[PDB]
Write a protein that binds this ligand. Structure first.
Ligand code: PLP
Ligand code: PLP
Ligand code: PLP
Ligand code: PLP
Lengths: 450, 444, 446, 450
């Protein structure tokens, strides 16, 4: 099996197929993987649709003109789900491979709008920055490094478990390109209060004239809030929310390879970033980092919109949230645990050990992670971001297909693991590491990217 | 079919399936599409492999630890195909969705290396630029716009049909982050002479101290040159070639969604861009893993000889069409050499003066028989030349080439019977632009 | 790839598969082919049914006795759709590969009935003829040549856009074996008025005693009229309609390979043509043939029923009416008929517009081909040979959205053609009074 | 269970699928069906090829231009297999649904050529006839009835087991349109001696000037003789053989729906029957009774030509013929049986009861047929055509896939059946029918059609 160089000659297809097969099987049962956000199941019709589109190159507008139009209609639907006030029927948005590229497009657009303002004012524009919670996902560090834009982080505390508007404004100045609240903080599952941030930013912008906008990183929540919390003002209903991004392959219910970013209107997307055509009466604007890319995920997204509709999406996310609330409530009743938040607003949540319990416990949540691994679960344990770095938490994500029976299966295994861990005569290795104030490698993938 | 808003209720899967089906069929027969570069066929085993990996998230290293390793082995293979001198077994490279993201990573790395030099020297670093031929593909304009880096374009002429080293150095200065020669220029099919650029850049860098490097945009040629022109020094064998990018889904023979970028060594990838656990570089996080399996399948199934046979057959059929086009009275080829499985031709100047038609009329004639053969004008200083381009991908047989040549001869016979000039023929005399219409992958 | 002789040795199956694959792909997108009448889509269950029956030989009645019965039940259903008055449970009909063989069986039956009468009367029977509109499909020319029967053609005019009964009777005589009205004229989409022909034929046959019958070529309309025009008397409700034929693979909604012919009763099928054995009469030109199309037809009857067939043809006719109405609103065009009775229709250029235009409908065809459409243009049959027309067929699956896509491309093409400085090649051919080669397949067969 | 009228409303597809399924299953095991000539197996690639082509209408030459060419290349290959002397690259032939339509096209062509001669001579042309063996298949009677052409039959005898040339000539006159020898007589498996008929016809035509030609009905033998008997002169090498027809779906090894007819040259196909076109440099002459028809069978035939080649076809028919000779030899060794012929030249043959044995036997070959039916076999018994109507024969056809093991399985059941029938105390019903001269219903399909 070639490690360094290409084989000199060919091998038969049957042998090559097995050789690749032998390195691509899952390490554990994916249905017991509670660490990932990403969709792993679509129905037979969606899968057949996307498998047959494996050879469709999305960028060829002459061969597949109506797939370009269908991309524009998905953008319309997402933008109207987020209550875009734009008057054109064809809304301003871009397809992406994930929230990663969608966030960067939002950040680049905010940066170019800021450069244009400061130039028109005669102010310097060489040291831009943006403001974000320490609970950011790694893509914002990629954005900071690849564009050389300073990242200013607002710490989490037990009194301010999400981005606090007052503390975010203390880090803003004439060089701030935007503030980034997160809907579905990957580390905590909570939503930054966008409406409170908008209220604070409006008063701050009138006092300063800096006109600092908001980009909402809604990788998870972007497909939860419109269906379950329609009255929560977090989107384009707010004055300073100029762009929003989301992962289509997390709670949009599509196989990996899908993200969306929308802008409040065409005038918040700088001219440098877009090229526009008129393909079959539509208004198709071309934005993005890629050229050639697979088109299958567009078909999957459009299939889901038609197959589920608003009510269909609402029932799926509702069932995920109910089972999450159920696990969240049962965890709270167990002596060792306390929840990070009393509210479950996305189908994920975190808990940690009560301080008084951890003091005398001979185990840590890393040992609980290992106990569950022995039964096939992936339930990640990790430390929280800055100012809460001493808190080891455990996170459960409830995706579509995770039934009430499987939730009782998980709670049964947690109770049995606690019964073993509580009878330990001596501290575990990770328990002693905490006593010595030595870091513990997180090991298990948790989507944070850190 | 919802245009603006999500439907309120659900519809049965069978109905929703047909509704999407009714909007995803090709407008023409893809096997007659000679405009596209991208692979459209893999064998049944590769297709089954990639279809089963539709639900595999590549970034989950706990669930699929060996797919991360398999990605690293593909990088080793590509980097060793390009004669990387790095001594570590695990070469420095990145998976990408295409040449687009791979080129940007190369450009961003060059920009960060340049910023690091100029800071350590006390020189300004706010007005970077890079040098490229006017035959660039649209991703380099995106790179210029999205990072606000000045693009300096070297024009094409009939004496310098590719990037000329002497003219490229006339646009370099202390603010130039790199020079980008292209292997497989999308508009012409030719290769910029990288070795001559390296020979010139070494003399210029010794005289100035600017240390301007080379990034090779080898989207097409990156999977052609190692197999058919092994003795052509264009890759990491050259002193100043620090990074190379390629499209895996063009002549790497993989379904759409694959690109590669490699660096000469770990020390040319800035610290800001990479962390190692296997180095994690790139613009994406979650992404489909199917294309990694497809590439690795092809490396094992074909090997060096298998890849060589596939690219050889493509190049031979291209040379065959190229040779038959040259024998027809209206046509003259842009180059006497076919080095990638694509080439362009135009109307002989003496013939065009009295002809009642243009190559746009030939394009329409071929469209009426189902072909997609694009016609367009060349980039700067050759903007007056309307050319036609044919790309020969795997599966385009000798029989289909004669089918194409037969239809070209039949169309020429029709166009020569014209009583009056065509609309586009009058457009040329009036000096009015003609909308290109047909996708040609240039992206302008 | 062998052109003249068989290869000497074998090639591996995978290579041979690709070699054949490389010559069987469509030249254009079939979903944009508006020229063809023939079904190209059945649902997954029908397709699985017919694919699994690929190896069933219909003629082996010992191995597949219930497929023979199922063929007889399809004949019953079609014959009852056409209001056959036959009293036997098992109606008289024949499976065919298409309307081609079904029409010939009807014509041969008419010819043998005519020979038998003239023998019993002592009159000659060596110079038979039949009467048909000039809008006939090529199978009737095959029939005329292969049986050496004179074809007498009734011309189309702008006053007589279909078969006119009075002019058809002027071509009848003691040697006429039948008159052939067409339901779904391939060139125009209209229906010959069968009831008027029966009304005229009844008076003519009483005055002469010739007893000239009717065979209805209903290749398209045979699966349209019973569902959308139940009160139109065109079938076995009429005295002189003795046989009817139809294409199962056009608007019967079955994959290629299916046609039906029915007779009003057993006594109108000559003894020479039938052998009987559930009652099963063995009529037809073939012996061994694929059985898949029988299963497909029977599936559609069960899956759709009367209401289901009615909805499918209703949507096709509605979309046809919609395109027909939008074409009429465009300045260059005028419709051949104000009524759309089958899911197809034709239009041509207004005479005043065409006289000064630089383009013809052949140029519009080329414009649409450049966008992937197949929309055929051709000249009409005799007395209307000067008229270039364009035809659209609306088959199952052609949606309202695709109809607007087509109308958008027609409007854009007209805007392009109206910018021409000089006449096109086909426009000059008209000025030179020279014919233009038809080029695009239009199902007429000429 | 609709019998007479169409159902009023729709039913779900799953139910309709089962409803049709319940009426299309074979009455017996098709692999034990030795009565049929028609192919029931192609390999997986051919089957996928033809299943995917179920929706291709062969006649639409604008949509599928090269399938028309591919049809012309199959005609070239078959015509060159039969040693056509035509010099044009594109040979004169027609696709057919089977030998039925291919034979009729040959007969109609002979009839129109004959009408043309008699007109040019001033002789009558109103009472045509043709000459054929009584072992004809039913298509020739259809031809006689549907075109009102007199059929003149040459009887079979024990001295003349095939068409005798001299006795066929005794039925010729100025009104004979052609003589039809059969290669693979459905009732006997033998080949009419075409070369001897040509020798007689040439002498007869020189004495009379009637110019009576030959059409060879080679439904079975047309795909056997060129591969196993290359030196047998039976085809276009003979002066008076002007047309030949064959069944592609019998020993051409294609699923049902394929026949071919070829003419010696363009001048023997009358102008009234053909319309020629030129596509991709190919004279595509369109002749035939059908218009729209399935194209799948064309692809299958061309696949077989490429996949098998000459040697591949030769090996397949060789194994079929070898197994046929093996069964033929074993039947001859059994006491009750005598073979109709000592030579097996097609993969089928017939035998009957020895006259001396039948005289005292209590059973007939109809009882042997019933014995084998009780074990699942279909082995037909029937009486021979005229002058041999007193002989009940049994026929075995050996198609591809019928292995040596299955042949011994068949011979084992025949030996056991003979042992059972020889223990009979009393004559069977069919044995008494023979003595009482009462006809016995044939019942079982034997492909003769009469
Ligand atoms: C073909 C080509 C590309 C391809 O980009 P994708 O992202 O793979 O579509 C990039 N750059 C150049 C110069 C090319 O010629
Ligand atoms: C989950 C998440 C993402 C997802 O990025 P992908 O490219 O879709 O993998 C991005 N940002 C944040 C803050 C997230 O929580
Ligand atoms: C077997 C045979 C046929 C076959 O006819 P199909 O139409 O292919 O079923 C025709 N004629 C003769 C003499 C045969 O023996
Ligand atoms: C359409 C049509 C046919 C169809 O013949 P097939 O054999 O089914 O292709 C026959 N006759 C007429 C008049 C038609 O319009």
């Amino acid at each position: 099996s070639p490690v360094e160089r290409i084989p000199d000659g060919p091998t038969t297809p049957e042998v090559a197929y097995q050789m690749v097969k032998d390195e691509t099987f899952a390490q554990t049962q994916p249905r017991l993987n509670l660490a990932t956000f990403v969709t792993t199941y679509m129905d037979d019709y969606a899968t057949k649709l996307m498998n047959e589109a494996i050879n469709i190159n999305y960028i060829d507008e002459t061969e597949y003109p109506r797939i370009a139009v269908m991309n524009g209609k998905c953008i319309n639907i997402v933008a109207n789900l987020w209550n875009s006030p734009e008057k054109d029927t064809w809304k301003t948005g871009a397809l992406a491979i994930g929230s990663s590229e969608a966030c960067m497009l939002g950040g680049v657009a905010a940066w170019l709008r800021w450069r244009k303002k400061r130039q028109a004012q005669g102010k310097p524009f060489d040291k831009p920055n943006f403001v974000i919670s320490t609970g950011f996902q790694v893509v914002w560090e990629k954005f900071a490094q690849l564009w050389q834009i300073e990242m200013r982080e607002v710490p989490l505390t037990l009194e301010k478990t999400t981005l606090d508007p007052e503390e975010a404004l203390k880090m803003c100045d004439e060089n701030t390109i935007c503030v980034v609240p997160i809907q579905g903080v990957t580390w905590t599952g909570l939503n930054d209060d966008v409406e409170a941030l908008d209220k604070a930013l409006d008063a701050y912008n009138a006092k300063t004239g800096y006109d600092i906008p908001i980009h909402v990183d809604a990788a998870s929540g972007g497909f939860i809030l419109p269906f379950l919390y329609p009255d929560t003002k977090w989107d384009f209903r707010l004055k300073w929310v100029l762009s929003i991004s989301v992962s289509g392959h997390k709670f949009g219910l599509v196989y990996p390879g899908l993200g969306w970013v929308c802008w409040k209107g065409k005038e918040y997307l700088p001219e440098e970033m877009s090229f526009s055509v008129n393909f079959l009466g539509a208004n198709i604007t071309q934005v993005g980092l890629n050229f050639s890319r697979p088109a299958a995920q567009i078909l999957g997204q459009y299939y889901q919109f038609i197959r589920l509709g608003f009510q269909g999406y609402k029932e799926v996310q509702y069932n995920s949230l109910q089972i999450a609330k159920y696990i969240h409530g049962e965890i709270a009743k167990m002596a060792p645990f306390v929840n990070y938040s009393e509210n479950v607003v996305n189908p994920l949540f975190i808990w940690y050990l009560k301080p008084e319990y951890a003091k005398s416990a001979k185990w840590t949540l890393y040992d609980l992670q290992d106990k569950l691994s022995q039964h096939g679960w992936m339930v990640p344990a990790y430390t929280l971001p800055s100012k809460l770095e001493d808190y080891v938490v455990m996170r459960v994500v409830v995706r579509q297909g995770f039934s009430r029976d499987m939730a009782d299966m998980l709670l049964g295994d947690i109770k049995n693991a606690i019964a073993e861990l509580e009878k330990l005569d001596f501290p575990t290795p990770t328990r002693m590491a905490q006593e010595k104030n030595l870091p513990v490698e997180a090991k298990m993938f948790n989507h944070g990217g850190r």
